[PDB]
Amino acid sequence: IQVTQSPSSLSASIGDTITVACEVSQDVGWAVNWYHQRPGRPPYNLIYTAHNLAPGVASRFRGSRVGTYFTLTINNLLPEDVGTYYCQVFDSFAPGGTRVDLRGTVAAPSVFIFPPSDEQLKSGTASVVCLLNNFYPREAKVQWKVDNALQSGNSQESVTEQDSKDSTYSLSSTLTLSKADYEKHKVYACEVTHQGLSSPVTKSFNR
């Protein structure tokens, strides 16, 4: 039995109605269960056997079955509904769930670049950090350039949870280079693409 959910992510305004779908690869009767997981919390049961609300779950949640196609509908969406929704059939979970967040005002990141410290450099390794601050939506693209050469495979990034008051995100990307490589080049730049930007923003320094 294969279980698939869609969409993988969605943004909704407070008060909206949204629908999440769970498709099962064969008829399983009504045996689909739904779980909600708020950020940093354990999952809890939301709906069981396609359409039964778990104890204490609000009536604005509705589960439905059409054959092998199961839906979770959330009416009058509230901030407490943010998190990930998972569907389950017997021992099978989908890959990935459906991440729900709130639709904030579209806002481009404020971008900052930080050179490695001389103290770190003594260790043989250099970290360059690019900060993307207080942006919405969560999707953003960071491209590192070193003397205009596109970097690939030597960065990692991390994103905050959605802010409770302004619905924005922040992102931090670290480019990791050897000291030997760091000292062979002059211009270090992070180029940022985001829906709130008409053209990419580049912050740079010269070593």
**What residues make contact with another protein under the rule CB under 8 A?**
31, 33, 35, 42-45, 48-49, 52, 54, 86, 88-97, 110, 112, 114-117, 119-120, 123, 127, 129, 131, 133-134, 156-160, 170-172, 174, 176
Closer to another protein by CB, 59 or 156: give it.
156
Q: How far apart are CA 60 and CA 38, in angstroms?
A: 17
* b/e map 161-190, b = 16+ CB within 10 Å: ebeeeebbbbbbbbbebeeeebeeeeebbb
Q: How far apart are CA 57 and CA 63, in angstroms?
A: 12
From residue 65, alpha-carbon distances to 9, 47, 84, 96, 156 in Å are: 21, 12, 20, 21, 41
Least CB distance from residue 148 to another protein, whole Å? 24
Mind spelling out the 3-state secondary structure of 149-199?
EECCCCEEEEECCCCCCCCCEEEEEEEEEEHHHHCCCCEEEEEEECCCCCC
Closer to another protein by CB, 129 or 197: give it.
129
Phi first, then psi, for residue 167 (nearest 5°) are 65, 20
Closer to another protein by CB, 52 or 76: give it.
52
Least CB distance from residue 57 to another protein, whole Å? 11
Closer to another protein by CB, 18 or 46: give it.
46
Least CB distance from residue 94 to another protein, whole Å? 7
Closer to another protein by CB, 15 or 42: give it.
42
Least CB distance from residue 188 to another protein, whole Å? 14
